[PDB]
Symmetry: D3
């Protein structure tokens, strides 16, 4: 049931995918998170204490969950992507995608030659140790590549990036984008808001779905109205912090 | 700093202490939990996958937190209590205390001879490796013992148990008490509610504060009105499960 | 999905169940082991370095596997069984069951009151954090109890043990039985073989299936012919040791 | 290589064995500790955060070290001893041995039937997965049992305990003995010193070597003069705490 | 109490800071190390088995310690620095800083745009999950950057490096410097000694404090006399090795 | 006994070395794997979930094994090699070695200046914390460098690569080579077979031994006949998968 990648297809079909970020970096809470019904969960390897050692336990925790696991790599480089592919990730979120070349490299990092440069191994979690049918051929067509536009250069080259073959979705990272535009900590600033819609619009111009992280409901709904389809509406860490604080406050004397 | 035990003092003063249960068994989420402001947190070793290997990481995660760490032991026996004391626990929740003798044994398990049977070690987290002043003497007077009345025999012997020297609080375990009274999964049944009130009354009669676990706000508020002072109003697990499901439902209905 | 317990049903139907022991105590190899197709896998907590900290990772590794996970507890006592139940084990192998009383205690340790003495918790892996329907009621009828007859007293009391309500299967532990009969390391001795057949006969007399661990194919096949139905035919450790040595020998003689 | 047990032989010969306690509970520092040249190292499972999960890593860290690994069990009970034996421990320190019966039980817990009650497993670290020659037979004669006399009853019954077959050494636990004699934290009190000498004398009377833990050089040297042969002269924790504080003080006064 | 960074200020004030290296890579011994009173502790990620998985446990172990935690990164590259910042490190030691450009990149790696290129996340250990006041603004002014001059190129460009804005301290790595000058294993060679004082002197010429690692007391004091202020006087590993060996030797027969 | 490197010498002597790949990434099974008698074991860090955290436990597990540990790095870059050297690896397998420059960099990454660029540390597992005699000098001559030729560029430059000083062996990675030649998943294709023998032949032309991974016996023997000497004949993962599946199939009804 590994292939076809249902998430990748849903995205292409322009269907709304509701997601949740994951930074708690442990299999116990992540197993619980997998019961919520989110369409996709982002195991953050860039801003959370996640790595191969924590990723496998969480992927195992998510076995049976309807949620599509997505790894947000620490950076766009071929080696860590090679390693994350074999441990079982079929969907990737690439931070700071600033040029056409970088978008091409990200895609190539997930495809075996001649299409890409992915290193070959005959047995691992990805092909469930040789039990995944026609693995080598099917893998090349079933990896989701979501590139993050969150820098001025990325915005400048958004068209070339979105036009890149293999780039399945254009994702806006609000915090870094805001910082890039001189508005650190203030993504709601008008100029950042304009940049966001511009990114969504250019994604659409190239037939690629757009996405974003929006933990504030009002923002998430506005982005959805603007045409975004794969929207992360919060994070396990954020809801845990908020919910635990609220419970304590409710009884505060 | 370690001593005097403020939590123990707060209980003796019959001051309200709002707590939260912990079963996520990992230092990452627990550090966040420590920011909530709960007066006490129960690291569950009876019904959650916690053990000494997970307890120390979480105790370290809670260093600096205003929340008093309390360990709920897997069972009332000397050995594990001996080990939990040395790793840094100064507050204990003892499950299934059904007789005066069992109450006395729990207390004795936390005190050095001649008062108790606690094994002696000269350096460990508890005396912060020899840096806690007058440790041996002060330790015996600074351990909190909270006994759980959650069985028919426990209810029958509640007076002798509450009258036991060293028993700092009388805690009601709703689920086991309900089951013991023939109402598994129905702690709201009048038979159970009546026993709870009775337990609270007898704790008061012997000058000991009473407590209970009540994840439903209405229940927690009723128990507080009845006079319980150390009330756990939820769990990190319950809060996490509910909050994540809620976020998903908000967008997926 | 969790209930009804198919393994328990298969045993009641006297259907053959081929199992494999597990002592490698890690999620990496165990996930691979789950692909083999064994009807049941025994995560050994008595003679292998397994504990709750290693059990959950392996249970997660086995999610989706057709193999029924069975835990062989370190000893027949209430507390550890209580803890193993909540982390997600629905099938148990109990070592050294020597009397009717011990058999009854093992069964009781897995059932909530009034039928048993199992401690109650409202959320854990066992009820998949509150998502298992009618959990409390169904759990009591869906736990498999396999008792090990591996001592002289166990043999003497095999009838009373097999007649005990809740005892789902009569399992022979070859090594301990051989030692108990004065033939340490020689389970093939006629004295031992005779006791095994006798045990199988008495299990059948009380309508309970019998089982045994037999890493030698000829032995396993003989025991199956004698009528044993849940037979462990090897271990991940034994298989690994043998296969790796064999590969090396093929080239180094 | 595994057998014969050289440490056990050294004790029988009444040869001095200098040991060091270990509580740092991790393989990194323990590997370094194994380079020190101590005759024996005690991996403390009673007063340090050690358990099977930390024991195997440290045993592996000590492979090749001339130091004999000794585990100090959390308590004198059959089950944990059974488990510690299989993971690779051949030398045991038993806390609170107070009667002849308890001494006999500790010994029996390490020997296979008919001599003892040790559970049988055909492959584990102890027999290095089936590579230790004549394992079953040799194991029964190669386990070291060191009993701790550290309670008033233990002192009263020291003769019967020392006379017990299988008891290889009589070890004095200073801290618990002092506490038992009403001198908590004052093992130097004459009452305690007198009991120690008496214990040493009775061990000698029954042809068994005596030992003790003495982190203060003057104390260790006095005990050696009195006739103790297996003396732990410190702990990795005590040495580390002292040495690091000393280095800091050298520059900060 | 996260900001202001007291260590960073102390350094700027030219106050002597006594430090200790840490390579034991575990929270147990590191918690003990934090009680010694060192002004700073270097959790080595370049030559010790430390990484994100070991760093968080040790940072938690150091909560409450007066010692300022400093991470010595594996190499000077933006990605690992990004990750180490979010896990809670506010002080960095950068190995092999050989050019002005590299010094600039190291500084920029720790500052949010427009000042630097640090990736943005709204919740993590660094801002204690949103509880650190005015975090985004304050963080950019509270990160300590200590660059290592330990290569011939670094020596050649020491002036440009020390003149770089954001470079708070010039640290000499003796072992690599010695090797670079053709004196591997002999930092005491006259030419290496001259290079060291030259580095200290150029640091001073640009108003930046100088530092070095000197486990031999005589060397540490000489360097202090030469004007160095942040001097690491040993390591947890070195003192442990020395102290354990000395204890054993003291009793060697 | 660390130096001289016996494996490195055996290779130079053109002696056949039978190896086995390791991807199970845990110390339990790897300790067992070390008993098989393979001449070398490759702890895979490129296609298996291995890293520093898993490498040290496995190296400790292999202490006492006659098998030479070899790490296959995730990629050819100086930083991870620096780190792997200090943790105790003396033999390296470098993936995708495509040019003379890259071969030179790999060699240099393992040698201290002036020969190479290896970073210097005075105490770590590699010099067993200062106990390895004449370490600094001997290390530079005792590291085995095995470069992988598994790309078209590597084949084109095989002569320059094999001629590089310090390159001890030319290893063919079949899967990547096949993919590079347009035959993904089909290394048996005639053109790949020709490329393999060509690589072996060019290795010989420069006096360097050749090696390859060949899990199919017929292939391994053919390669040996072609002149290859360090041949990996399988993997722990592959044999485990095959052997466990076979055992289950043997009894399948
Ligand atoms: Mg971003
Ligand atoms: Mg309860
Ligand atoms: Mg048995
Ligand atoms: Mg003691
Ligand atoms: Mg250096
Ligand atoms: Mg390859």
């Amino acid at each position: 049931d590994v292939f076809p990648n249902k998430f990748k297809a849903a995205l292409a079909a322009k269907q709304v995918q509701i997601g949740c970020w994951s930074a708690l970096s442990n299999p116990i809470s992540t197993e619980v998170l997998g019961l919520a019904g989110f369409d996709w969960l982002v195991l953050d390897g860039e801003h959370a204490p996640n790595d191969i050692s924590t990723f496998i336990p969480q992927l195992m925790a998510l076995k049976g969950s309807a949620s599509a696991p997505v790894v947000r790599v620490p950076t766009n480089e071929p080696v860590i992507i090679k390693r994350l592919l074999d441990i079982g990730f079929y969907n990737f979120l690439i931070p700071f995608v600033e040029t056409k070349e970088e978008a091409e490299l990200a895609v190539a990092s997930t495809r075996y030659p001649p299409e890409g440069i992915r290193g070959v191994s005959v047995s691992h979690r990805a092909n469930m140790f040789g039990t995944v049918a026609d693995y080598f051929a099917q893998s090349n067509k079933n990896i989701t590549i979501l590139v993050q536009i969150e820098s001025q250069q990325g915005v400048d080259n958004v068209d070339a990036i979105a036009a890149t073959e293999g780039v399945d979705g254009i994702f806006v990272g609000p915090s870094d984008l805001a910082a890039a535009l001189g508005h650190l900590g203030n993504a709601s600033h008008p100029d950042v808001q304009k940049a966001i819609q511009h990114i969504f619009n250019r994604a659409s111009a190239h037939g690629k779905p757009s996405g974003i992280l929006a933990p504030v409901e009002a923002d998430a709904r506005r982005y959805l109205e603007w045409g975004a389809t794969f929207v992360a509406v919060g994070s396990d860490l954020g809801v845990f912090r908020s919910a635990t604080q609220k419970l304590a406050d409710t009884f505060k004397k």
